[PDB]
Amino acid sequence: PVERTGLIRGLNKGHKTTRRVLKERPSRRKGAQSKRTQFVRSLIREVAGLAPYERRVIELLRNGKDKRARKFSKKKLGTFGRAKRKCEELQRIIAESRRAH
Amino acid sequence: PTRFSKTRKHRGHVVGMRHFHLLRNHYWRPSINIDKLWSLVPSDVREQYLSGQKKDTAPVIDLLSHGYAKLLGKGRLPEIPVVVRARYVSAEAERKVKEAGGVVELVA
Amino acid sequence: RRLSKEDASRVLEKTKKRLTHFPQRKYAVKA
Amino acid sequence: NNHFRKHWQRRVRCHFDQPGKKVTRRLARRAKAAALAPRPVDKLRPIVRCPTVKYNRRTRLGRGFTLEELKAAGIPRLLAPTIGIAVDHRRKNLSEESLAANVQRLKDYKARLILFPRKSNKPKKADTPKDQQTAETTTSLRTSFGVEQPLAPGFTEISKSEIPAGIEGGAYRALRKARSDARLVGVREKRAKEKAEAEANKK
Amino acid sequence: GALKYLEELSKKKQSDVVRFLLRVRCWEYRQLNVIHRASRPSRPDKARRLGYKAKQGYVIYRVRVRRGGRKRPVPKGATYGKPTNQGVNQLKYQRSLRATAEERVGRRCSNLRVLNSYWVNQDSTYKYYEVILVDPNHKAIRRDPRINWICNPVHKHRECRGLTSTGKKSRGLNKGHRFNKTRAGRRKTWKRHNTLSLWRYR
Amino acid sequence: IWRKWHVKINQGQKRFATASALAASAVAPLLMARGHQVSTVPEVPLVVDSAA
RNA sequence: AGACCCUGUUGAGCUUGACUCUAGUUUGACAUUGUGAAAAGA
RNA sequence: AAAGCUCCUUCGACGAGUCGAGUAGUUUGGGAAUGCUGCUCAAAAUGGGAGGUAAAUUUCUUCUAAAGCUAAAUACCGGCCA
RNA sequence: UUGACCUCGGAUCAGGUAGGAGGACCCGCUGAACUUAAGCAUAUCAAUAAGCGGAGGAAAAGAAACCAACAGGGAUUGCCCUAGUAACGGCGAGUGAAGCGGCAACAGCUCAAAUUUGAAAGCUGGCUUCGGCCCGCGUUGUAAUUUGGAGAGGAUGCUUU
């Protein structure tokens, strides 16, 4: 950790204390992928397939309309970041399909 | 009381910005002038300093311990060196401290 | 219609273990 | 600005039962003390520093001790609430000073703690022997283990040769320079990155 | 454990198999009664995570409720007070259709206690829910410390007072600044704020 | 019931009034003006021994 | 203390391309809504 | 037979028509930052929510939602006793 | 043909439960108008009166998807203060919190997501000689272990019932 300057204003302001590094709290471990979760999620993907709007975004990304796919994903999902994550996940899906074929 | 009222006597004869979610704790900085600076010292030791019986020792005053954040420079200081612990200080306050022979260093 | 005393005093097994090994102790603090 | 435009008389609360409620609270406290004798009536509380820039000058009592404080004091997390020690699992020790103060507090509590055995006939090694079970005791942990020095000592003496020289340029100048750097930090990496890109382009 | 697989597949509600089963079960439940007992939960993973157990004393009731907004029961659908700049078609009930489903299931079988409920299917006209109920008079229930809290008389009709999960959601009992008015009870907080406290030595 | 029944008094004024009352209690003419029968009292203020 | 006249921050009943609404009616879209073919295209 | 402490290569499952987005009604000090409900769309895995001005990019700080229990301090024009 | 399930039924079957009263306080739902704004469709009265459903001696809330930006506090509830402040408001009458701080009282926990698989170890009911035995429920999961504060798998040597 960066040592504080001991000032009331400016960069790194605050009273000087000896900072400690802590063991990572297990509550903050959420979001990490596990082997069981990864295997189950991949198998469930193979069992179930894709949504109709997911297939539409697949078609747009195969056709090369990346901005149109991002716009359609944002319209469907409601969030630009979620649209970007869905688009990159479908890039991974298309890449795996191409490397399989 | 009813008996003192006048009714008893009258018996028979009738801009700028909008700051959403303002937290006052952000802007907490009480200020103290240098003419009240020696008042923070207890009376006996302050009397000894103003009398002049201790020539080799200088007082250190923490404003945040007394509840003040900024040292202002209204008034004049005696010729006694005083170390002052402060978060903020004004330019002529610190200048009059330098004339008095002390120093103002910053704390947080 | 109230629960019986025995059913009200039924307690879980891990709680029983923790009450067996770390119960509320009798203690005092010096002055 | 008088807010009496509603049916305010329907929800007027008077406080004639203030002495009666105080007597009731005192009777409840006396009953609690009689039930919990010889233990103190309250739990041991740590010393913590108040949040925000207004109150960080002062310390106070917290909810409970942290798990790393208990581990450094040698008290397990299951034995701790049974000997009058409050436990707070949400609070963390981000600094060494508060951690050291709280572990010293717990060590003093453990040194002053008298622990009676679960069975009188069969005492154990961690339990207090009967010849040392008798002493003058306290019943108020808030009083015996209170915050002794809540604020920093605002009156200290140093020698005149020990006077600090001070920051160069002046304290007001240092404040203004720190504020200026804080306000102008981002344009400085922006200009530095532009200069580095220009140097890479025309090296 | 297969329940993890059921969870992850039940997440994908737009897949072919899930849409097919939802369609056929919607038809079956539409042909059945509005409130009827289900012999076993059709979503075992959701029932288990909401608190159902394979023990004598747990009952599942399936229920359908008409969806949409609410209509104020005035004759000829028109109000004769001040103009409102809205119709009766745009009135919104402040509780969920899931809570209404819990109401009707509890009234149908009042000798039990509603534990929770969950969405199972929906169509244009109805929404379909399954409600878990626990019998407080069954000995296997009364001997189990994980569930015998519901045998206390304070838990009589939790869904009528909003003590189920949808009740907490509709009452807004969440910590934080976004829930300043309703985290302790809206009417209680309003009465606390509008109460004029006058002390003796004022 | 929300009429002002109680009156808040400064503690300094309370202690001042108590001091004035105790000072008046040592004045034998003020005892007569008060109306007590203190003619046979040996001394004012009257002190009795704590052993009795 | 009827009737008549005059006044009102007047009340109430009724009418109308007076104002803002609304029941009802009409139009468009979305979901309920599934299964195939035969073509036209990209 | 259970239970606690200490150390560690490693593992570490954590709640879906749910969160979120738009819209309408209602409500709020949150008519730029509130909550609830209906309709439509509809999520993810260091992910998600929040950080009271809309958005993009790079960071940081906090917790770990969509399952559940729990006394006390608090309220009391009903009933009983005083 | 004889059976085994699954689902749906019948029975004055064996054993139980709910209705109504009360409703001052409590949890919700629904919901005005007089009144104040010159009048008045925003607003105010008021998220009130009336109406409806549901508990208890308290109820509810409650152990952070919190507050903060600090040297960080640390479940819920209530009092004082914050504060008539931030903020909202036709043509303005007005409306109006929250963090921190002090106090009263303080208490922490249970599941789902894991295979016991070298042994469903779990539970309702009937008969009892009170030792137990049967009919069943349940593998579409009852026991034990774990809940993020972690825990699981090893190593280690002492402590507790």
PDB file of C-alpha atoms in Angstrom, chain E residues 32-165:
ATOM      1  CA  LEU E  32     -56.658 -28.146 -14.453  1.00  0.00           C
ATOM      2  CA  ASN E  33     -58.318 -26.081 -11.727  1.00  0.00           C
ATOM      3  CA  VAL E  34     -57.253 -22.588 -10.660  1.00  0.00           C
ATOM      4  CA  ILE E  35     -56.045 -23.941  -7.298  1.00  0.00           C
ATOM      5  CA  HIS E  36     -55.113 -27.611  -7.092  1.00  0.00           C
ATOM      6  CA  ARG E  37     -52.733 -29.806  -5.138  1.00  0.00           C
ATOM      7  CA  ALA E  38     -49.572 -30.900  -6.919  1.00  0.00           C
ATOM      8  CA  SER E  39     -48.405 -34.337  -5.812  1.00  0.00           C
ATOM      9  CA  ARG E  40     -44.727 -33.404  -6.193  1.00  0.00           C
ATOM     10  CA  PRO E  41     -43.004 -30.100  -7.035  1.00  0.00           C
ATOM     11  CA  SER E  42     -42.415 -29.642 -10.759  1.00  0.00           C
ATOM     12  CA  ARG E  43     -39.247 -27.639  -9.935  1.00  0.00           C
ATOM     13  CA  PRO E  44     -37.546 -29.735  -7.222  1.00  0.00           C
ATOM     14  CA  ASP E  45     -34.350 -27.654  -7.112  1.00  0.00           C
ATOM     15  CA  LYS E  46     -36.271 -24.400  -6.595  1.00  0.00           C
ATOM     16  CA  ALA E  47     -38.552 -26.037  -4.019  1.00  0.00           C
ATOM     17  CA  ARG E  48     -35.559 -27.449  -2.128  1.00  0.00           C
ATOM     18  CA  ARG E  49     -33.708 -24.129  -2.107  1.00  0.00           C
ATOM     19  CA  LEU E  50     -36.870 -22.349  -0.913  1.00  0.00           C
ATOM     20  CA  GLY E  51     -37.310 -24.905   1.878  1.00  0.00           C
ATOM     21  CA  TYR E  52     -39.250 -27.967   0.718  1.00  0.00           C
ATOM     22  CA  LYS E  53     -38.214 -31.337   2.153  1.00  0.00           C
ATOM     23  CA  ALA E  54     -39.216 -34.938   1.440  1.00  0.00           C
ATOM     24  CA  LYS E  55     -40.945 -35.218   4.805  1.00  0.00           C
ATOM     25  CA  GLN E  56     -44.518 -35.877   5.906  1.00  0.00           C
ATOM     26  CA  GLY E  57     -46.069 -32.450   6.417  1.00  0.00           C
ATOM     27  CA  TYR E  58     -44.930 -30.626   3.257  1.00  0.00           C
ATOM     28  CA  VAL E  59     -47.622 -29.873   0.667  1.00  0.00           C
ATOM     29  CA  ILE E  60     -47.320 -28.270  -2.775  1.00  0.00           C
ATOM     30  CA  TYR E  61     -50.243 -26.320  -4.220  1.00  0.00           C
ATOM     31  CA  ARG E  62     -50.269 -25.067  -7.801  1.00  0.00           C
ATOM     32  CA  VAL E  63     -52.231 -21.901  -8.507  1.00  0.00           C
ATOM     33  CA  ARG E  64     -52.996 -19.609 -11.443  1.00  0.00           C
ATOM     34  CA  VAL E  65     -53.715 -15.874 -11.104  1.00  0.00           C
ATOM     35  CA  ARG E  66     -54.908 -13.422 -13.761  1.00  0.00           C
ATOM     36  CA  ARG E  67     -52.080 -11.062 -14.685  1.00  0.00           C
ATOM     37  CA  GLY E  68     -51.989  -7.367 -15.515  1.00  0.00           C
ATOM     38  CA  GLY E  69     -53.043  -4.341 -13.513  1.00  0.00           C
ATOM     39  CA  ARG E  70     -56.103  -3.763 -11.361  1.00  0.00           C
ATOM     40  CA  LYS E  71     -59.433  -2.033 -11.946  1.00  0.00           C
ATOM     41  CA  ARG E  72     -61.108   0.077  -9.271  1.00  0.00           C
ATOM     42  CA  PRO E  73     -64.590  -1.409  -8.599  1.00  0.00           C
ATOM     43  CA  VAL E  74     -66.765   1.589  -9.469  1.00  0.00           C
ATOM     44  CA  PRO E  75     -69.867   1.277 -11.688  1.00  0.00           C
ATOM     45  CA  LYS E  76     -69.450   2.212 -15.377  1.00  0.00           C
ATOM     46  CA  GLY E  77     -65.678   2.371 -14.771  1.00  0.00           C
ATOM     47  CA  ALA E  78     -65.673   6.140 -14.182  1.00  0.00           C
ATOM     48  CA  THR E  79     -64.881   8.291 -11.158  1.00  0.00           C
ATOM     49  CA  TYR E  80     -66.928  11.313 -10.057  1.00  0.00           C
ATOM     50  CA  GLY E  81     -64.258  13.066  -7.992  1.00  0.00           C
ATOM     51  CA  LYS E  82     -61.431  15.307  -9.188  1.00  0.00           C
ATOM     52  CA  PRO E  83     -59.988  14.388 -12.616  1.00  0.00           C
ATOM     53  CA  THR E  84     -57.093  11.954 -12.351  1.00  0.00           C
ATOM     54  CA  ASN E  85     -55.476  12.145 -15.843  1.00  0.00           C
ATOM     55  CA  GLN E  86     -55.614   8.331 -15.966  1.00  0.00           C
ATOM     56  CA  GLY E  87     -58.059   5.511 -16.534  1.00  0.00           C
ATOM     57  CA  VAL E  88     -58.896   2.417 -14.525  1.00  0.00           C
ATOM     58  CA  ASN E  89     -56.781   0.450 -17.015  1.00  0.00           C
ATOM     59  CA  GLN E  90     -53.589   2.047 -15.629  1.00  0.00           C
ATOM     60  CA  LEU E  91     -54.011   1.223 -11.927  1.00  0.00           C
ATOM     61  CA  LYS E  92     -51.267  -0.936 -10.417  1.00  0.00           C
ATOM     62  CA  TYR E  93     -51.698  -3.234  -7.429  1.00  0.00           C
ATOM     63  CA  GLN E  94     -48.978  -2.620  -4.847  1.00  0.00           C
ATOM     64  CA  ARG E  95     -48.513  -6.350  -4.153  1.00  0.00           C
ATOM     65  CA  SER E  96     -47.417  -9.103  -6.497  1.00  0.00           C
ATOM     66  CA  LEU E  97     -49.542 -11.710  -8.231  1.00  0.00           C
ATOM     67  CA  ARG E  98     -47.309 -14.194  -6.397  1.00  0.00           C
ATOM     68  CA  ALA E  99     -48.536 -12.696  -3.111  1.00  0.00           C
ATOM     69  CA  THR E 100     -52.151 -12.884  -4.333  1.00  0.00           C
ATOM     70  CA  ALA E 101     -51.507 -16.542  -5.202  1.00  0.00           C
ATOM     71  CA  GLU E 102     -50.215 -17.150  -1.676  1.00  0.00           C
ATOM     72  CA  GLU E 103     -53.357 -15.453  -0.319  1.00  0.00           C
ATOM     73  CA  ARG E 104     -55.704 -17.695  -2.279  1.00  0.00           C
ATOM     74  CA  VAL E 105     -53.740 -20.866  -1.471  1.00  0.00           C
ATOM     75  CA  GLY E 106     -53.706 -20.040   2.252  1.00  0.00           C
ATOM     76  CA  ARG E 107     -57.439 -19.344   2.235  1.00  0.00           C
ATOM     77  CA  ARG E 108     -58.005 -22.659   0.439  1.00  0.00           C
ATOM     78  CA  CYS E 109     -55.922 -24.582   3.014  1.00  0.00           C
ATOM     79  CA  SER E 110     -55.814 -22.434   6.160  1.00  0.00           C
ATOM     80  CA  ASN E 111     -54.813 -25.328   8.434  1.00  0.00           C
ATOM     81  CA  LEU E 112     -51.251 -25.184   7.040  1.00  0.00           C
ATOM     82  CA  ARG E 113     -48.675 -22.390   6.928  1.00  0.00           C
ATOM     83  CA  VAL E 114     -47.322 -20.854   3.725  1.00  0.00           C
ATOM     84  CA  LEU E 115     -43.534 -21.153   3.681  1.00  0.00           C
ATOM     85  CA  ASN E 116     -42.704 -19.742   0.227  1.00  0.00           C
ATOM     86  CA  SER E 117     -43.807 -19.860  -3.402  1.00  0.00           C
ATOM     87  CA  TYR E 118     -42.214 -19.670  -6.824  1.00  0.00           C
ATOM     88  CA  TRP E 119     -43.049 -18.922 -10.444  1.00  0.00           C
ATOM     89  CA  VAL E 120     -43.417 -22.044 -12.569  1.00  0.00           C
ATOM     90  CA  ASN E 121     -44.966 -20.864 -15.878  1.00  0.00           C
ATOM     91  CA  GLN E 122     -46.970 -18.043 -17.440  1.00  0.00           C
ATOM     92  CA  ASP E 123     -48.996 -17.120 -20.516  1.00  0.00           C
ATOM     93  CA  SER E 124     -50.829 -14.039 -21.788  1.00  0.00           C
ATOM     94  CA  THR E 125     -53.783 -14.365 -19.396  1.00  0.00           C
ATOM     95  CA  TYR E 126     -52.427 -16.090 -16.272  1.00  0.00           C
ATOM     96  CA  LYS E 127     -49.310 -16.492 -14.179  1.00  0.00           C
ATOM     97  CA  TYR E 128     -48.679 -19.861 -12.540  1.00  0.00           C
ATOM     98  CA  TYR E 129     -47.089 -20.439  -9.144  1.00  0.00           C
ATOM     99  CA  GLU E 130     -46.316 -23.314  -6.796  1.00  0.00           C
ATOM    100  CA  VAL E 131     -46.714 -22.688  -3.062  1.00  0.00           C
ATOM    101  CA  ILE E 132     -44.943 -24.691  -0.344  1.00  0.00           C
ATOM    102  CA  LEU E 133     -46.957 -25.262   2.824  1.00  0.00           C
ATOM    103  CA  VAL E 134     -45.971 -26.852   6.121  1.00  0.00           C
ATOM    104  CA  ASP E 135     -48.400 -28.554   8.502  1.00  0.00           C
ATOM    105  CA  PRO E 136     -47.805 -27.222  12.045  1.00  0.00           C
ATOM    106  CA  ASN E 137     -49.925 -30.028  13.539  1.00  0.00           C
ATOM    107  CA  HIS E 138     -47.759 -32.885  12.224  1.00  0.00           C
ATOM    108  CA  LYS E 139     -45.406 -34.541  14.709  1.00  0.00           C
ATOM    109  CA  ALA E 140     -42.510 -34.855  12.249  1.00  0.00           C
ATOM    110  CA  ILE E 141     -42.751 -31.097  11.711  1.00  0.00           C
ATOM    111  CA  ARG E 142     -43.037 -30.319  15.426  1.00  0.00           C
ATOM    112  CA  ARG E 143     -39.986 -32.430  16.306  1.00  0.00           C
ATOM    113  CA  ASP E 144     -37.690 -30.829  13.705  1.00  0.00           C
ATOM    114  CA  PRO E 145     -35.814 -27.750  15.019  1.00  0.00           C
ATOM    115  CA  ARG E 146     -35.179 -26.448  11.485  1.00  0.00           C
ATOM    116  CA  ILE E 147     -38.906 -25.925  10.839  1.00  0.00           C
ATOM    117  CA  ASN E 148     -40.755 -25.859  14.204  1.00  0.00           C
ATOM    118  CA  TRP E 149     -40.506 -22.052  14.326  1.00  0.00           C
ATOM    119  CA  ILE E 150     -43.547 -22.022  12.019  1.00  0.00           C
ATOM    120  CA  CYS E 151     -45.624 -23.854  14.646  1.00  0.00           C
ATOM    121  CA  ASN E 152     -45.595 -20.707  16.796  1.00  0.00           C
ATOM    122  CA  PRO E 153     -48.814 -18.632  16.724  1.00  0.00           C
ATOM    123  CA  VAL E 154     -46.912 -15.520  15.584  1.00  0.00           C
ATOM    124  CA  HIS E 155     -46.538 -17.108  12.115  1.00  0.00           C
ATOM    125  CA  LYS E 156     -50.279 -17.459  11.486  1.00  0.00           C
ATOM    126  CA  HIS E 157     -50.873 -16.254   7.896  1.00  0.00           C
ATOM    127  CA  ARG E 158     -47.449 -14.852   7.031  1.00  0.00           C
ATOM    128  CA  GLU E 159     -48.600 -14.116   3.476  1.00  0.00           C
ATOM    129  CA  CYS E 160     -51.490 -11.972   4.755  1.00  0.00           C
ATOM    130  CA  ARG E 161     -49.061  -9.728   6.651  1.00  0.00           C
ATOM    131  CA  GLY E 162     -46.319  -9.771   4.022  1.00  0.00           C
ATOM    132  CA  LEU E 163     -43.818 -11.959   5.871  1.00  0.00           C
ATOM    133  CA  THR E 164     -43.034 -14.124   2.837  1.00  0.00           C
ATOM    134  CA  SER E 165     -40.231 -13.209   0.431  1.00  0.00           C
TER     135      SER E 165
END
